[PDB]
């Protein structure tokens, strides 16, 4: 380090320079008293939207205002207040006769993109990092409660998935498992943040693997392995067929939430899981329409 | 004072006389990766002046019936210069960007463009029109390269999201009666300290006309649009043989 | 053991209850969090960002959807003609549905605070004109002429080097909070009306286009607040997502 340009170089500066900083704001802003102004050179009402910043005009600079002390709280618009509410994310059916799951067991891939309400709420942001709380409600298709014993097992990726009601994988020597009866109140557990990355991704613009990207492999576009957390498996504890048909519903609630980079909200109807496809022949406007611009 | 500007980096310089200030995305300047955030153990390389410089892409034509175009980063520079060579010789990559868009006309023309940066821009399909087919976009559409791609349904941004809310992202306007350029500075945005430059695109750039271009007969009818961009604080790691894709 | 009694409310499952649940993975430690730009702490931060307001929500055909983001202005006979009108309710069906503020208000029942709308002129450099933009508090009907409209809150806009003007809609209400207004008895929570009139004229020289367009942007002030979170009015699903 003896030449001048290396000494004065700024290469390697790892400190991020921020232009803004956060300030406390427990309530809404107050209003100050203002009077009339008649002068030249000061134009609060004139803006330039081409810059890309929002208008900075206020109430006091446009009309004559009184003094109002505002004490309305802003606590209800925090991320946890918005997100810490349980919602339906999954549903598993175990019929006695049929074709879906006729052998008294089922395997469900963990994803929360199968229902519109939760998906639309969570897709407002790009990255999210949180803990979760899961509740399982089980009953017959008519809502009746019956004396049956069930077992839930969490299967992380790479672990053997059960393939029958008497599979050896049900020994759950290491995998976490829950035994519960239908007559009991719904089961409920806590889940940590388990992604290999620093946050979950609702949108991944890329491909998972290297190589040539032919037409037959286009289904891999947008698939992020960091969001795949495993499988949820359920069975009836017994060596014989059960005597009742059962349905299991799954609800999830977030805790300790953080988010980044908001995005525009969804406009069209959802069609497929983990795919932003839309019907091209049925594009509809965001809101309602009227008959003329000069009438209400 | 705020209408004239000069941008100098590397061995390139850009001058303008009708600027509209500079937007710094999310209020953060680009920076290098810290020791507490890094995970790879090998020493990275920082070519500095040979990669951090202004590059000019192709030129598009603005017409009275245009819809809009988009580009993907850093896919545009994958096959251009020393930056491209470093990108295809290394496994890991991270950098910021500075984007400048030029479009000039006369005092008798009119129109307005919206320039915005949308991180993780995922493209969708029309699902066969009826919405019953699970189709997927082709490779040439997701990573169009340095040529860009023309939008088909600009109202939904080809992804089922309204364009009216695109202003929530870092953006600027090009109003022909006010300015003729737009400048945006974007830091590195990702959930990982490093990532592959060939498989993953960090963000996309959108240029969509909201107010149609108009002029009277006899004026110049050719109104080009040019894109100029420059990496900032580039780092590479994981050296092995060059792969193009 | 310790004697106890069970009270009504046991064994129930309330979706908004905050409690403690048994962990599934003991001694598990998550991945460290690196710095990511653009963190959001409160939803009120997003309510102050301007988005395009669809004043011209007349057309419905597919190829003309993009025209909903602008409305035209041209030369008139100089008699204070009307340009456009719309309602000022942010949570009501209409123009405000295209803004992020309206979508966010769709998740809450009551709101309070001031609003602001910005208009940008996208004509040629040689075009000049003046416009009057008025806000009518609740109770008054839709104005029939400029003379009636000027009696309320208004601003006069002059075209020039600065291509944008801001109209501020101050909070004028009898209650501290307003619910989402609609037709019926709930029109009691209405906000008012906004109208735009020609002040002098739209003037251009020889060789300039005769028509120009105006783009409107809307957001909220710093005293805006919402409460009593609820579900959105519309569900974007018409069957089973599969």
């Amino acid at each position, epitope marked *: 380090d003896r030449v001048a340009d290396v000494i004065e170089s700024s290469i390697g500066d790892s400190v991020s320079r921020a232009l803004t900083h956060a300030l406390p704001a427990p309530t809404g802003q107050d209003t100050q008293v203002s009077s009339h102004r008649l002068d030249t050179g000061k134009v609060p009402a004139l803006q330039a939207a081409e810059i890309g910043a929002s208008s900075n005009a206020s109430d006091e600079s446009m009309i004559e205002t009184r003094c109002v002390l505002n004490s309305h709280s802003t606590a209800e618009t925090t991320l946890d207040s918005f997100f810490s509410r349980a919602g339906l994310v999954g549903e598993i059916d175990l019929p006695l006769k049929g074709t879906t799951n006729p052998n008294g067991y089922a395997n469900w891939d963990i994803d929360i993109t199968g229902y519109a309400q939760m998906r639309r709420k969570v897709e407002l942001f790009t990255y999210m990092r949180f803990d979760a709380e899961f509740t399982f409600v089980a009953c017959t298709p008519t809502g009746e409660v019956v004396p049956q014993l069930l077992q839930y097992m969490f299967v992380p990726p790479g672990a053997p998935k059960p393939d029958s009601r008497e599979s050896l994988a049900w020994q759950t020597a290491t995998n976490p498992s829950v035994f519960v009866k239908l007559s009991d109140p719904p089961a409920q557990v806590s889940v940590p943040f388990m992604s290999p990355a620093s946050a979950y991704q609702w949108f991944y613009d890329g491909y998972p693997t290297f190589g040539e990207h032919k037409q037959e492999k286009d289904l891999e576009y947008g698939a992020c392995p960091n969001n795949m957390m495993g499988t949820f498996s359920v069975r009836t504890v017994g060596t014989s067929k059960s005597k009742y048909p059962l349905v299991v519903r799954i609800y999830m609630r977030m805790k300790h939430v953080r988010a980044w980079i908001p995005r525009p909200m969804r406009n069209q109807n959802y069609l497929f899981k983990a795919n932003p496809n839309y019907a091209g022949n049925s594009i509809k406007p965001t809101g309602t*329409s009227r*008959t*003329a*611009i000069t009438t209400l | 004072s705020d209408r004239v500007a000069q941008l100098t980096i590397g061995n390139s310089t850009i001058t303008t006389q009708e600027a509209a200030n500079i937007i710094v995305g999310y209020g953060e300047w680009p920076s290098y990766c810290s020791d507490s955030d890094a995970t790879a153990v090998d020493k990275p390389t920082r070519p500095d002046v040979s990669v951090n410089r202004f590059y000019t892409l192709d030129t598009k034509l603005w*017409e*009275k*019936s245009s819809k809009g175009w988009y580009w993907k980063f850093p896919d545009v520079l994958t096959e251009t210069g020393v930056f491209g060579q470093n990108a295809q010789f290394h496994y890991l990559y991270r950098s910021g960007f500075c984007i400048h868009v030029q479009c000039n006309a006369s005092k008798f023309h009119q129109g307005a463009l919206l320039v915005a940066v949308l991180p993780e821009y995922v493209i969708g399909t029309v699902a066969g029109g009826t919405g019953t087919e699970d189709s997927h976009p082709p490779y040439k559409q997701t990573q169009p390269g340095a040529d860009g791609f023309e939008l088909q349904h600009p109202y939904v941004l080809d992804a089922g999201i309204p364009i009216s809310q695109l202003t929530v992202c870092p953006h600027q306007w090009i109003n022909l009666r006010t300015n003729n350029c737009a400048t945006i500075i974007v830091p590195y945005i990702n959930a990982l300290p490093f990532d592959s430059a060939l498989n993953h695109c960090n963000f996309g750039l959108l240029v969509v006309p909201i107010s149609p271009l108009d002029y009277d*007969q006899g004026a110049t009818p050719v109104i080009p649009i040019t894109i100029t961009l420059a990496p900032m604080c580039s780092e590479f790691a994981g050296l092995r043989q060059a792969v193009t894709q | 053991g310790f004697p106890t009694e069970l009270k009504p409310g046991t064994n129930q499952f309330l979706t908004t209850d905050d409690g403690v649940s048994a962990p599934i993975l003991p001694n598990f430690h998550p991945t460290p969090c690196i710095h990511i730009p653009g963190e959001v702490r409160n939803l009120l931060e997003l309510c102050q960002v301007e988005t395009i307001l669809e004043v*011209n929500n*007349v*057309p*419905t*055909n*597919a*190829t*003309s959807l993009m*025209e909903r983001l602008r409305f*035209p202005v041209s030369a008139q006979a100089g008699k204070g003609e009307l340009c456009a009108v719309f309602r000022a309710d942010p949570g009501r069906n209409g123009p405000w549905q295209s803004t992020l503020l309206g979508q966010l208000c769709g998740y809450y029942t009551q709101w309070s605070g001031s609003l602001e709308v910005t208009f940008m002129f996208t004509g040629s450099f040689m075009a000049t004109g003046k416009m009057l933009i008025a806000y009518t508090p609740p109770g008054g009907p839709l104005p029939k002429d400029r003379a009636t409209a000027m009696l309320g809150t208004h601003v006069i806009w002059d075209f020039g080097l600065q291509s944008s003007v801001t109209l501020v809609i101050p909070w004028i209400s009898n209650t501290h909070y307003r619910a989402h207004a609609r037709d019926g008895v709930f029109d009691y929570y209405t906000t008012g009306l906004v109208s735009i009139w020609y002040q002098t004229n739209y003037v251009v020289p020889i060789g300039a286009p005769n*028509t120009a367009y105006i783009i409107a942007l809307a957001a909220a002030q710093k005293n805006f607040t919402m409460k009593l979170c609820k579900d959105a009015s519309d569900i974007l699903q018409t069957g089973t997502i599969q």
Partner: antibody
Framework: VQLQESGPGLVKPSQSLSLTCSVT?????????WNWIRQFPGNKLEWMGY???????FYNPSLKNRISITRDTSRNQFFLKLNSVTTEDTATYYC????????????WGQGTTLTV | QIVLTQSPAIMSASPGEKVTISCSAS?????MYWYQQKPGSAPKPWIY???NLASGVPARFSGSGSGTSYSLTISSMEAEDAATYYC?????????FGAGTKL
């Protein structure tokens, strides 16, 4: 949607022309562009002009200062008027509904013959 | 104004043969549109966006082209599909039509 043209079949030279189109099954204020097109006896087609869903007009520069298109939203009709008709202005006149710089609905009428 | 040139002016073909007509533009356009007109009636849209088939059109029709050159082809010739065809553009106003091809 159905379109029907009507008007005089014979007009003396140097007079004024007026045609009428009636729309059924769709409101002319809900969208689309409504055009006027004529076909000369030599089987040559020429586009004349249009009226917008909101009342905006645009005319062919060759026919400028001689054409005017109006509308009547109450009765759901739009009109075509010509000034100082000459001998060369004889053709079959069609009315069509179109999109904005693209194919959207493109349903044509049946046409009415004019002799001058 | 954009000028469209159609060729050939007149074509004659036998059933089962291959028919191909071309339309050329004086400037680059995004798409090309086609019409069919039987004598005594009004023109009916046939092809839009150079590939999509209009409703009620037999599947033997197809179109292609890019830039300033576009073509319309018929796989098999029948007696029913014999009329005058036009090429029309939506790139800029005023809208212009081709001269027409009689089959």
């Amino acid at each position: 949607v159905q379109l029907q043209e009507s008007g005089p079949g014979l007009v003396k030279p140097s007079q004024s022309l007026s045609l009428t189109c009636s729309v059924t099954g769709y409101s002319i204020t809900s969208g689309y562009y409504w055009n006027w097109i004529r076909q000369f006896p030599g089987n040559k087609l020429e586009w004349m002009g249009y009226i917008n869903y909101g009342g905006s007009n645009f005319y062919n520069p060759s026919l400028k200062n001689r054409i005017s298109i109006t509308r009547d939203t109450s009765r759901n009709q739009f009109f075509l008027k010509l000034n100082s008709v000459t001998t060369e202005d004889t053709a079959t006149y069609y009315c069509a509904r179109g999109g904005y710089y693209d194919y959207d609905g493109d349903y044509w009428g049946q046409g009415t013959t004019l002799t001058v | 104004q954009i000028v469209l040139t159609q060729s050939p002016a007149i074509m004659s073909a036998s059933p089962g043969e291959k028919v191909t007509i071309s339309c050329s533009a004086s400037s680059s356009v995004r798409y090309m549109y086609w019409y069919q007109q039987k004598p005594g009636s009004a023109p009916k849209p046939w092809i839009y966006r150079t590939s999509n088939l209009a409703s009620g059109v037999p599947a033997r029709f197809s179109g292609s082209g890019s830039g300033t050159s576009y073509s319309l082809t018929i796989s098999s010739m029948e007696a029913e599909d014999a009329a005058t065809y036009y090429c029309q553009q939506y790139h800029s106003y005023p809208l212009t039509f081709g001269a027409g091809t009689k089959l």
